[PDB]
Structure formats: C-alpha cells, structure tokens
C-alpha cells in the first residue's frame, strides 16, 4: 500500500 | 529469502499538451502488482498481479484516493521546482520518486528508502537513519527546509517501519506461490565462428526469477570481465528474465573457457563449457 498524505516538494 | 516493496512515481509536465501526467507503479521484488495512470480514460488503481485481486473495494478506493491526490500534489511540485531552478514555462520537466522497504530473511525491516529526482538528477533523499535528508543542491535545500518544518521524515519513518512492512508481509503471504518461488535459469553455451581465427562463445541464462543473477566467463580459471560482452538482464514477458555473456576466443582454445552461473533458484552453482 502506498504512502498517504504525501507533501509537495 | 530477502524481499522488498517499492513504489515508482513519474510526474511529467508537457506545456501545450495538458496538465502533467502522473503515473505510479508498485512492485514486490521484480513483480509489478499495481498501476495508476492519470492519462487513463478513467484513472483508477488497477491490479497487475493475480494475488492482489483479492483485496477488497476499500483497498482499491484507498489506493485511488491517494494516487488522485498525488496527481495534484506532484503538479504543484513541478511548478515549485520550475521556480527553484528559474526555468521558463516552455520546457517539459520530470519529477521521479521511488520509496519502499527492504526485509531480511527474518521478515524484519532491513532498511527503508525514499529518493526523489528532477530531470533525471538526484534531488533529495531520505538518509538510512530515516530521520534526516540529503539535498543535492540549493534548490533541494528549499524542499528540505519545508520537509523539516512539516516533519516529513517522521512521516516516512512511520510508514516505512509500519504500513510498508505490514503490507509487504501480507503480499508475500498472499502471493507465496510466486513471490517466494525462485525459478532457476535454463542454461546452455552456443558457439559462433567469427573467422578462421576466432569464435564467439555465448553463455545463456533463460527463464529465471528473480532478476538477480551472476554470469561470468573464466579463462584458465581467470575472470574475463574486460573481454566479456554482458547484456543487460531483460524481461521475457512471462515474469521471467534472460541474460547472456559472450567472449571471443581463439579457435581450438574453447575448452580453456568456463561459464559460471549463480542464482537463488539453483540447487548449486553451475559450471558450463561448450559441448561440441
């Protein structure tokens, strides 16, 4: 399962 | 054996041709198991391995929500980085990210990974401590500062040590008949005269899984690295891989050469010679 709540660069 | 899970994201801008494409693929070891493509007619997470198909609707909804959100997030990231490098709106640019976990033979976390690249160059990476970052340049330092302020490393650590490992173990169990099966290479040596004076010996390895393999030629027991043509390991299309190694040898000296094969699926390492 992929990472949640990923933040922008 | 040891296993890993990775997600690979590509976000590519294309000025004049719509919004940036976002594609995500997930792998366990050398087996792809899911894909998401913002360019699909109806973007949704799709299964790419039989053992993932048993996951419920909640799983697929969750994946798709994440990837749809990522599509927007990575578009903002592309805008940000264009600015960090003082680039015009005219060119196409690419952000790539790869992250995931490695497990040891014990099933425990060996290490976690999280790396990003911009236009094919390393940009920012999570260090092995899962607590600090390595920024490639002053642009990536801007990202690093933002990520430190937002506790992103802590977020990645929690994921890598928790959900990543927990789900990888689940996939490995559900797909045990394939993911935990090493298929040995089928091997043979072919002989191809190039002239009166020389001939090519080619050592073949076919139908193996996983892709990791060691293929080498020796002459009188001495490694022939510099004189060996070793093609990149290549996918057969049926989950398995192929590779070959070739050396050009003097006519009549063929028996001084041996091909050595190492692979997880083999009962024991192979030593092959040309058999006329």
């Amino acid at each position: 399962i992929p990472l949640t709540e990923e933040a922008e660069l | 054996g040891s296993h890993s899970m990775r997600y690979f994201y590509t976000a590519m801008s294309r000025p004049g041709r719509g919004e940036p494409r976002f594609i995500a693929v997930g792998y366990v070891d050398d087996t792809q198991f899911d894909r998401f493509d913002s360019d699909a007619a109806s973007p949704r997470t799709e299964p790419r391995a039989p053992w993932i198909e048993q996951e419920g609707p909640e799983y697929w909804d969750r994946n798709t929500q994440i990837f749809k959100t990522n599509t927007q997030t990575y578009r903002e990231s592309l805008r940000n980085l264009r600015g960090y490098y003082n680039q015009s709106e005219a060119g196409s640019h690419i952000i790539q990210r790869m992250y995931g976990c490695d497990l040891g033979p014990d099933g425990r976390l060996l290490r976690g990974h999280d790396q990003s690249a911009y236009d094919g160059k390393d940009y920012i990476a999570l260090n092995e401590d899962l607590s600090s970052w390595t920024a490639a340049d002053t642009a990536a330092q801007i990202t690093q500062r933002k990520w430190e302020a937002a506790r992103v490393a802590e977020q990645l650590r929690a994921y890598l040590e928790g959900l990543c490992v927990e789900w990888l173990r689940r996939y490995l169990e559900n797909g045990k008949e394939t993911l935990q099966r090493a298929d040995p290479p089928k091997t043979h040596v072919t002989h191809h005269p190039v002239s009166d004076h020389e001939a090519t010996l080619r050592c073949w390895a076919l139908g193996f899984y996983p892709a990791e393999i060691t293929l080498t030629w020796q002459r009188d027991g001495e490694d022939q690295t510099q004189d060996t043509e070793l093609v990149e390991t290549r996918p057969a299309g049926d989950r398995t891989f192929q590779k070959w190694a070739a050396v050009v040898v003097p006519s009549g000296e063929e028996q001084r050469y041996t091909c050595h094969v190492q692979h997880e699926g083999l009962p024991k390492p192979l030593t092959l010679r040309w058999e006329p």
């Binding site: - | 590509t10 792809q32 493509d37 690419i94 790869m98 996918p235």
Partner: protein
C-alpha cells in the same frame, strides 16, 4: 541531462521456425521518458503491439518492454525501430535469434 536508449530485440522462448512465440523489444537506460517504439515485420509496422507500464531503474533511467505475438520463419525479417530525442533519426535493430 539526456540519456539515449539501450535496445534489445529478442524472443520470449527459443526461436523455432513455424512455432508461435513472442517478439520483444526492450528499451532501457533512457531519459526523458517520451519514446517511440515500433516492431517491424519485413520493414512494415506491426499493429496492436502492447507495452509495459512506465517504470525506472535505480539510476532514474526509464525502461519499457514492447511485445507482440509472432511466428518465426526462415525468410521473415523482424526488427525494432526506436525514436527518442537523443536520436538524430530512428534507430532500427534487427532481430537475431542468436542474441
């Protein structure tokens, strides 16, 4: 900033004339991701060719597999034609069952 594709053309199974097989064109080591790949039979583009989902290696370079069903014969010539921003003109790699 840009990397030209490596190209391998080969069959899924050992080639035997008259027996159905799969023709593969594997492009790898390239950047950026846009790439044009055609499989050819006697110089003519094969239709309905399928390909893998875009992914990349540890060094960030992209790779794709293009493939189609085919029946090798003595006379028929197969090849892969690749175009990429790094190439001045499309590169054609002929299928050689010995490689």
């Amino acid at each position: 900033i840009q990397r030209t594709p490596k190209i391998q053309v080969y069959s899924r199974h050992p080639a035997e004339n008259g027996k159905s097989n799969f023709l593969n064109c594997y492009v790898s080591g390239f950047h950026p991701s846009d790439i044009e790949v055609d499989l050819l039979k006697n110089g003519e583009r094969i239709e309905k060719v399928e390909h893998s989902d875009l992914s990349f290696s540890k060094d960030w370079s992209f790779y794709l597999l293009y493939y189609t069903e085919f029946t090798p014969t003595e006379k028929d010539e197969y090849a892969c034609r690749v175009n990429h921003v790094t190439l001045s003109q499309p590169k054609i790699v002929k299928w050689d069952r010995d490689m």
